[PDB]
Design a protein around this ligand. Structure first.
Ligand SMILES: CSc1cc(F)ccc1-c1ccc(C(=O)NCC2CCCCC2)c(S(C)(=O)=O)c1
Length: 178
């Protein structure tokens, strides 16, 4: 299935493209509804798709970004207030922080040592195997990180953040690639 972003989930700091394949930080927050699905405290958005089974793959361009978070989450994740992105809270993600620091969302966090900074990241979900894998497309498809034995029981969602607002330092888009 072609991944698309779900506008009803998108925090007001986010701008989505018409085709729902791109998200980026605005310079101000949009004035939009405060509906239950919307992430209210962080620049986060979900894919529209709900996965219950099977293997799934998508590719995200992160070119020129100082920070981002990508992965998968439970449909049931809290949308309102503040929280950590732990597997305990229903998140399997990796991120870039501060231009150079890549990490996997294990507890404690697993530092990722990427000699070649990715411009595109490939994300695989294998529902039945309980695996979420991340590949460095730029570095000829090297494995960044794999979460294993995730033991999923309910629906999952693609998860994205193009960063925190940071005075214009991270306005480059996140784009799903064909
Ligand atoms: C807009 S979320 C975001 C966006 C980015 F562009 C780049 C990174 C993040 C981002 C990653 C991770 C976390 C986070 O939960 N870290 C805590 C550890 C999680 C794994 C288990 C040990 C504790 C946060 S947060 C919500 O604390 O702010 C944010």
């Amino acid at each position: 299935v072609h991944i698309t972003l779900d506008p009803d989930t998108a925090n007001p700091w986010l701008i989505l493209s018409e085709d729902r394949r791109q998200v980026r930080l605005g310079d101000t927050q949009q004035s939009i509804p405060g509906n239950e699905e919307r992430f209210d405290s962080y620049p986060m958005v979900l894919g529209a798709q709900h996965f219950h089974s099977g293997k799934h793959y998508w590719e995200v361009d992160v070119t020129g970004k100082e920070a981002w978070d990508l992965g998968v989450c439970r449909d049931s994740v809290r949308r309102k207030g503040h929280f950590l992105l732990s597997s305990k809270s229903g998140f399997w993600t990796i991120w870039l922080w501060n231009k150079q620091k890549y990490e996997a969302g294990t507890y404690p966090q697993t530092p990722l040592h990427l000699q070649v900074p990715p411009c595109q990241v490939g994300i695989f979900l294998d529902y039945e195997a309980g695996m979420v894998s991340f590949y460095n497309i730029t570095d000829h498809g090297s494995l960044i990180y794999s979460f294993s034995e995730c033991a999923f029981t309910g629906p999952l969602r693609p998860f994205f953040s193009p960063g925190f607002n940071d005075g214009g330092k991270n306005t480059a888009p996140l784009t799903l690639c064909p």
